[PDB]
Symmetry: C3
Subunit: 79 residues, 3 copies
Amino acid sequence: MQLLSGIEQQQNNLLRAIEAQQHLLQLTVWGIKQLQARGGHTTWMEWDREINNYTSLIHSLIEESQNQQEKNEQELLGG
Amino acid sequence: MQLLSGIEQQQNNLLRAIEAQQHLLQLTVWGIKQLQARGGHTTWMEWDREINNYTSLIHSLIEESQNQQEKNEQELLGG
Amino acid sequence: MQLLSGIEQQQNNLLRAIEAQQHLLQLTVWGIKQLQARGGHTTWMEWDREINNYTSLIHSLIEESQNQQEKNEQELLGG
């Protein structure tokens, strides 16, 4: 159970990173639509905050995925 | 065969989502180049349609990846 | 060892593609911030070069991930 659990669990990390990256894509699509339609300083500050919130989350999911890769490989070698 | 098939098959779903997200990236890169070069209402309507077409596809691939994760985990537990 | 090695190794390819796509996201976020703040021809040429450098890398990682999927599936079938 132990090794296949680590493999399936890393597949969820990669999926979570894909989901988080997809939301970051919608934020970039939103920004392109605003500029094409053209001011709102308060709105663009919130946009910057959400870009950072999801950037920090993606890097956390990338780090967690890197940590699981090392554990899955450690388990494969000599197990 | 059954469990490793479900694992390999979910790796293809994640890859398909990465491929679909990559094409959505080129659409956002295209939009940034248009604004930097500056009108074309018909062209930006087609751009919005392709943003939605690939957004709907990515969510379909994310949902399919979530469905396979549950099936792979169900199979691991008690199998 | 052979099959699970190919599965774990493809998980690293997908993670490398996610990492490369994430850097391409920051380049698109950078471009949106420049236009919102508004000229710099030399800077936008370097931006285009880095968009292509990471686009070429992502497609290389997508191709490598597609090559590993076929090898993992070949190994599963009749092994």
